[PDB]
UniProtKB/Swiss-Prot annotation, chains A, B, C, D:
Effect of residue 70 to A: Shows a specific deficiency in the secretion of the translocase SipB/SctE. Shows fully assembled needle complexes, but has a reduced number of needle filaments. Is drastically affected in its ability to enter into host cells
Additional detail: The levels of PrgI/SctF are reduced in an invA/sctV mutant, probably due to protein instability, and are increased in an invJ/sctP mutant.
Protein name: SPI-1 type 3 secretion system needle filament protein
Organism name: Salmonella typhimurium (strain LT2 / SGSC1412 / ATCC 700720)
Effect of residue 55 to A: Exhibits constitutive secretion of substrates. Retains the ability to display SipD/SctA at the tip of the needle filament
Similarity-based family: Belongs to the SctF family.
Result after altering residue 53 to A: Exhibits constitutive secretion of substrates. Retains the ability to display SipD/SctA at the tip of the needle filament. Does not yield assembled filaments in vitro
Gene giving rise to this polypeptide: sctF1
Superkingdom of source: Bacteria
Effect in UniProt of substituting residue 10 to A: Exhibits constitutive secretion of substrates. Retains the ability to display SipD/SctA at the tip of the needle filament
One term of GO molecular function: identical protein binding
Resulting phenotype, residue 56 to A: Exhibits constitutive secretion of substrates. Does not display SipD/SctA at the tip of the needle filament. Is non-invasive. Can polymerize into filaments in vitro
Key word Protein transport present: yes
Amino acid sequence: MATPWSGYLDDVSAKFDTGVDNLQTQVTEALDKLAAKPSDPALLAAYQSKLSEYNLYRNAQSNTVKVFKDIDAAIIQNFR
Amino acid sequence: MATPWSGYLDDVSAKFDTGVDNLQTQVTEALDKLAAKPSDPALLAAYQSKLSEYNLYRNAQSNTVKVFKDIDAAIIQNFR
Amino acid sequence: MATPWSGYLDDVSAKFDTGVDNLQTQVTEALDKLAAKPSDPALLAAYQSKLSEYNLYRNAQSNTVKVFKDIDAAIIQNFR
Amino acid sequence: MATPWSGYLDDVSAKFDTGVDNLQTQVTEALDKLAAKPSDPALLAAYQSKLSEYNLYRNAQSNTVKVFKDIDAAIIQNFR
């Protein structure tokens, strides 16, 4: 049997991965559609919201690892 | 079973879609009608009202994502 | 193979062009006919109606590019 | 064999390029036509719309590269 990787920081990353799982394909689909369409009321606005959603996936993930590693580093320094 | 995308910002966007669902086809139908018509006072007033209806929908999406993102950005940046 | 220019704003402009394609030649034909005539009730009413049709083509095109660019500018500004 | 440059930010730039590939020559053609004419309502509306399209290419490109670099900079700062 395979043993799943148990981690607090890894779980948070996987939580966002499952949420925007199909969102990744939606971003690339809207990006290619806009490529051959200069000005688009629909495509540009749709991509606007979907791009910011991707923006949060990368920002929120980097924020959780930032806070966790900082406080965790202080604990590791105590062990001496 | 498939799980739907649960989001506050996504709900507002999809909420406007249900309202202008058949409205999108009405814009293209009136566009082709005017394209092959020299001058009509009736179709001019019809397209005029339908044009802004689309304008308000698209501007509402960029509006909700703008005000919600600004306040949410301050919250996520607080997490440090 | 040649790739056609795909654009929503350009489609609206070309839409009116297919409608008043032979209309442009009709305006110049009636203009020269009016210039060689002192006063005629028939050509006056004919040119009057055809003049407004040309006015609708130039106005409808400038109207669509104006309302569309305004709303699309809001979206573009969000990208930051 | 040659290896193509794989980049997300570069892909977005080239994405807009494939669309307005022949538009660059269309802008210069309309520019020379405008300089060789005193005043034309037809070319004024044409160049106006085409100038908006060139603004689309330079804006969306600079817009996407700006938001992507910001969140990407946060990740790089995390690696320490």
